[PDB]
């Protein structure tokens, strides 16, 4: 199955991403104020890219293309120096249409030379090929290429792509364990939790669940979940807590979910024993690269839950 | 049930909101750059307040208080001229914690004089009383109260509280029809849709479903749902599409959901035949005040779905009336 093969191509995708970055690094100088536009997974990727832009001392704003089209007055757009359009195919109509409205320099991110790249001042084509309807390793690949480009543009040191790729290899090693979780626990809904850069990862993981498994999935900033959303967590809920650094509040939060009889998978960059039901540790990376190894974990989890439900994640109902 | 009663108090909340505004209008001038901080319902309210700040030509940013505590560098915060903390009780620990780290002027929005109001430079206290763990009419009252303060600060005409309140009187007259939807369709999940100011209303509605009904509910910017999310809508799904203005893309979207066998409830300020299964027309208002009548409606829908499932929305399982943490990690003495 394509989806699984493509998830497992993640380490090679990082290497391709570094190559794509290198090809464009002197052609494209990312400015400080950047607007990011995408749909579906590419919107959650836009959010991630906006976050790292802020983290490096710029101003990053993301919104869905249709909100830019119909409700831009409601959003803190300001005066971006660059607008980034994102589409895996490069043929997403809404992205093309949003960018047509814009006279600002534009950059297109895609897996293909496409309408999108051909409509922009600049293009970052990351040739991670996916035949699945569901975006997997391309999300991660686009993210890494853009990370390097941002770092290069802001005069920061580059990351070591071999090191990042290796982190995703170590994450993919948890495949058999992830299978086991899906076998051990017949969960009926799932809550993904993350803060900062792990929040868009939570949003994307929850989308993988919807698309691949037609499943009840939710995503929240880590501690925000206590404020009413936790009501839907019980003995049939898996809570996937993702954190780069852990502190006493995460211990309490795991225990609060366990008190409602939910089971907790803790995914972290650091060993921490909070009594969680399941644990996956991924290698520590720089602050900005940190989310990268979490992606193939949640992609594998989503894939195996869809297969358990007798579904084909390569071509989901209703989806183009 | 206190929650029904409190939802029905929405008109009276608008008047009280107008009076809280009048009490502070000459003491507080809102600037152009404002950060909004809240949690749960008050976070979704913060998103609404940020949006109207942008609409009125300022810069409004909103994030959950815990994201400000632990991940603020990820957000386009900038250099706000005012930070607004929101908490119905005024005792939500994360609001106090976030505000303590801020040196800029601070405004507290609460239903009570409280830790929050004491910790801020200025306070917008709106005395809507709610006994339910679930926030309802206080959301709408705080919203209207702040909307006045923004227009006043920005030298704009004030809204007419009386007209806004009558708008919600009309919305509430849909109570019977709302039960009928619930009686009619045993839906197993719900998707709320809205664009701009109606998108936070969609998030809030979907939170009311979680809290009151312990139910599978989702919320999206209207046309964003098309990108993969629509996969979970089938014959067991109610799609609640809310829109001020209605156009051709709205028609195609309705039909796309119909083709998946879902049923559609259309809440709008007009009466158009788009193929929907259910229809609710709410009074038209100024563009910023437009979301106000939609709130009672989705609160009623959540309430009636809860009651049909035999649940108690005044005191949902697990939920805490005030969401708290130990505030000071060492008691200094």
Give the integer Cα–Cα distance in Å for B172 and B168: 6
Instruction: Give the closest of A69, A76, A211 to B76, CB-based.
Output: A76
Contact partners, residue B200, CB within 8 Å, separation at least 6 = B44, B45, B47, B48, B51, B194, B291
Contact partners, residue B157, CB within 8 Å, separation at least 6 = B151
> Cα B140 to chain center, whole Å?
7
Contact partners, residue A296, CB within 8 Å, separation at least 6 = A7, A8, A10, A136, A137, A140, A168, A171, A172
Closest among A54, A48, A104 to A81, alpha carbons compared: A104
Q: Are B225 and A68 in contact (CB under 8 A)?
A: no
Give the integer Cα–Cα distance in Å for A16 and A25: 14
Q: Which helix (H) or strand (E) holds B281?
A: strand B278-281
Write down the CATH number for the domain with range B2-159.
Answer: 3.40.50.10490
- Where does CATH 3.40.50.10490 sit in chain B? 2-159, 160-310
Top residue of B36, B66, B88 to mutate, by most chain A CBs within 10 Å, is: B66
Give the integer Cα–Cα distance in Å for B196 and B202: 10
Query: In chain B, how many H helices and how many E strands?
Result: 12, 10
Give the integer Cα–Cα distance in Å for A95 and A101: 10
Top residue of A55, A60, A193, A318 to mutate, by most chain B CBs within 10 Å, is: A318
In chain A, residues 140-179 whose CB comes closer than 8 Å to chain B: none
Q: Are B94 and B67 in contact (CB under 8 A)?
A: no
Give the integer Cα–Cα distance in Å for B26 and B149: 10
Note whether A76 contacts B260, CB cutoff 8 Å: no
Closest among A25, A19, A17 to A150, alpha carbons compared: A25
Contact status of B59 with chain A (Cβ, < 8 Å): yes
Give the integer Cα–Cα distance in Å for B276 and B97: 46
Note whether A40 contacts B224, CB cutoff 8 Å: yes
Q: Are B98 and B37 in contact (CB under 8 A)?
A: yes
Structure tokens at B62: 């909103």
Contact status of A13 with chain B (Cβ, < 8 Å): no
| DSSP structure class, residue B274 | S
Long-range contacts from A102-107, C-beta under 8 angstroms, 24+ separation: A104/A35, A104/A80, A105/A81, A106/A82, A107/A28, A107/A82, A107/A83
- Looking at the DSSP bridge assignments, the partners of residue A220 are A193
Give the integer Cα–Cα distance in Å for A126 and A136: 13
| DSSP structure class, residue B215 | -
Closest among A218, A215, A232 to A305, alpha carbons compared: A215
Structure tokens at B158: 């004030």
Give chain B positions within 8 Å (CB) of A231: 210-211, 214, 316-319
Closest among A288, A267, A285, A266 to A277, alpha carbons compared: A266
Give the integer Cα–Cα distance in Å for B205 and A284: 39
Cα–Cα distance list, B169 to A82, A192, B7, B111, B160 (Å):
46, 39, 11, 22, 14
DSSP codes of every residue in A122-186: EEEE------SSS--HHHHHHHHHHHHHHHHHTTPPPP-HHHHHHHHHHHHTTHHHHHHHHHH--
Contact partners, residue A273, CB within 8 Å, separation at least 6 = none
Write down the CATH number for the domain with range B160-310.
Answer: 3.40.50.10490
Q: Are A36 and A60 in contact (CB under 8 A)?
A: yes
> Cα B123 to chain center, whole Å?
20
| DSSP structure class, residue B294 | H
- Where does CATH 3.40.50.10490 sit in chain A? 2-159, 160-311
Q: Are B152 and B28 in contact (CB under 8 A)?
A: no
Note whether A223 contacts B94, CB cutoff 8 Å: yes
Give the integer Cα–Cα distance in Å for B242 and B250: 10
Contact partners, residue B23, CB within 8 Å, separation at least 6 = none
Q: Are B297 and B178 in contact (CB under 8 A)?
A: yes
3-state secondary structure of B233: coil
Closest among A206, A217, A222, A190 to A299, alpha carbons compared: A206
Instruction: Give the closest of A66, A134, A222 to B224, CB-based.
Output: A66
DSSP codes of every residue in chain A: -HHHHHHTTHHHHHHHHHHHHHHHTTT----SEEEEEE-THHHHHHHHHHHHHHHTTSEEEEEEHHHHHHHGGGS-----SEEEEE-SSS--HHHHHHHHT--S-EEEEESSS-HHHHTSSEEEE------SSS--HHHHHHHHHHHHHHHHHTTPPPP-HHHHHHHHHHHHTTHHHHHHHHHH---SEEEEEE-TTHHHHHHHHHHHHHHHH---EEEEEGGGGGTTGGGG-STTEEEEEEESS--HHHHHHHHHHHHTT-EEEEEESS---S--SEEEE-----TTTTTTTHHHHHHHHHHHHHHHTT--TTS-TT--
Taken as a whole, chain B contains a residue count of: 333
Q: Are B30 and B154 in contact (CB under 8 A)?
A: yes
- Alpha-carbon dihedral B313, B317, B319, B325, rounded to 10 degrees: 160
Note whether B227 contacts A41, CB cutoff 8 Å: yes
User: Residues B244, B250, B254, B257: is their CA dihedral positive or negative?
Assistant: negative
> Cα B10 to chain center, whole Å?
13
- Residue B43 CA neighbour count, 13 Å, CB half: 22
DSSP codes of every residue in B296-332: HHHHHHHHHHHHHTT--TTS-TT--SS----S-SS--
Give the integer Cα–Cα distance in Å for B112 and A44: 37
Q: Which helix (H) or strand (E) holds B85?
A: strand B82-86
Domain A160-311 in CATH 3.40.50.10490: yes
Closest among B121, B93, B125, B100 to B110, alpha carbons compared: B125
3-state secondary structure of B182: helix
Contact partners, residue B281, CB within 8 Å, separation at least 6 = B268, B269, B270, B271
Closest among B109, B126, B106 to B31, alpha carbons compared: B106
- Alpha-carbon dihedral A187, A188, A193, A198, rounded to 10 degrees: 80
User: Residues B70, B76, B79, B84: is their CA dihedral positive or negative?
Assistant: negative
Determination technique for this PDB entry?
X-ray
Structure tokens at B287: 């563009």
- Return the residue matching tokens 């940020």: B50
Instruction: Give the closest of B197, B226, B325 to A249, CB-based.
Output: B325
- Alpha-carbon dihedral A257, A260, A263, A267, rounded to 10 degrees: -10
Give the integer Cα–Cα distance in Å for B130 and B2: 8
Closest among B47, B190, B170, A215 to A206, alpha carbons compared: A215
For B117-179, what is the HEC assignment? HHCCCEEEECCCCCCCCCCCHHHHHHHHHHHHHHHHHCCCCCCCHHHHHHHHHHHHCCHHHHH
Structure tokens at A94: 């809404």
> Is B101 part of the annotated catalytic residue set?
no
Structure tokens at B157: 């005409």
Cα–Cα distance list, A34 to A56, A105, B6 (Å):
12, 10, 43
Cα–Cα distance list, B227 to A134, B236, B283 (Å):
11, 20, 31
Q: Are A296 and A172 in contact (CB under 8 A)?
A: yes
Nearest CA in chain B to A68: B196
Contact status of A74 with chain B (Cβ, < 8 Å): yes
């Amino acid at each position: 199955m394509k989806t699984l093969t493509e998830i497992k191509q993640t380490p090679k995708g990082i290497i391709k991403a570094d190559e794509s970055f290198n090809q464009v690094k002197d052609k494209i100088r990312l400015p400080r104020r950047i607007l990011y536009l995408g749909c579906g997974s590419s919107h959650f990727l836009a959010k991630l890219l906006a976050m790292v832009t802020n983290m490096h001392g710029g101003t990053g704003v993301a919104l869905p293309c249709s909100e830019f089209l119909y409700s831009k007055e409601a959003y803190p757009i300001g005066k971006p120096e660059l607008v980034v359009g994102i589409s895996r195919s490069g043929e997403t109509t809404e992205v093309l249409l949003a960018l047509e409205k814009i006279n600002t320099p534009k950059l297109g991110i895609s897996a293909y030379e496409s309408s999108l790249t051909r409509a922009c001042d600049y293009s970052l084509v990351v040739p991670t090929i996916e035949e699945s309807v569901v975006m997997t390793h391309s999300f991660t690949a686009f993210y890494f290429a853009y990370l390097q480009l941002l770092r290069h543009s802001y005069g920061l040191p580059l990351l070591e792509a071999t090191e990042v790729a290796k982190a995703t290899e170590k994450a993919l090693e948890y495949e058999n364990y992830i299978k086991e979780i899906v076998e051990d626990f017949d969960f009926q809904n799932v809550i993904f939790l993350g803060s900062g850069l792990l929040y868009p990862v939570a949003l994307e993981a929850s989308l993988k669940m919807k698309e691949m498994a037609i499943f009840w999935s939710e995503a929240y900033p880590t501690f925000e979940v206590r404020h009413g959303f936790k009501a839907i967590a019980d003995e049939n809920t898996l809570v996937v807590l993702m954190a780069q650094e852990l502190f006493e509040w995460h211990k309490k939060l795991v225990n609060e979910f366990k008190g409602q009889r939910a089971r907790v998978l803790l995914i972290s960059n650091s060993q921490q024993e909070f009594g969680q039901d399941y644990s996956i540790e991924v290698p520590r990376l720089s602050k900005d690269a940190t989310p990268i190894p979490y992606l193939p974990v949640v992609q594998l989890l989503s894939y195996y839950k869809a297969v358990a439900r007798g579904l084909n994640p390569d071509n989901p109902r209703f989806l183009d």
